Design a protein around this ligand. Sequence first.
Ligand code: ZN
Ligand code: ZN
Ligand code: ZN
Lengths: 71, 4
Amino acid sequence: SLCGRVFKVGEPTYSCRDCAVDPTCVLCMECFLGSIHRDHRYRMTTSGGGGFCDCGDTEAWKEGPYCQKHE
Amino acid sequence: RLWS
Ligand SMILES: [Zn+2]
Ligand SMILES: [Zn+2]
Ligand SMILES: [Zn+2]
């Protein structure tokens, strides 16, 4: 019911510069584009692999902790 | 979180 995605090599990753609690907080593309943060200032990277999507971690986001799929 |  929640995301829990582990990033794969080459996978696009997004952080909301406005809402992230700190610079380690990130979303997969599915969760980013299904969240409020698609209309905010963001930082996109291409993943080296490993790490995980923070969708649903209510302590990672100051607003919009979930996307529309996982709410 | 990002892996680093
Ligand atoms: Zn996700
Ligand atoms: Zn999600
Ligand atoms: Zn945001």
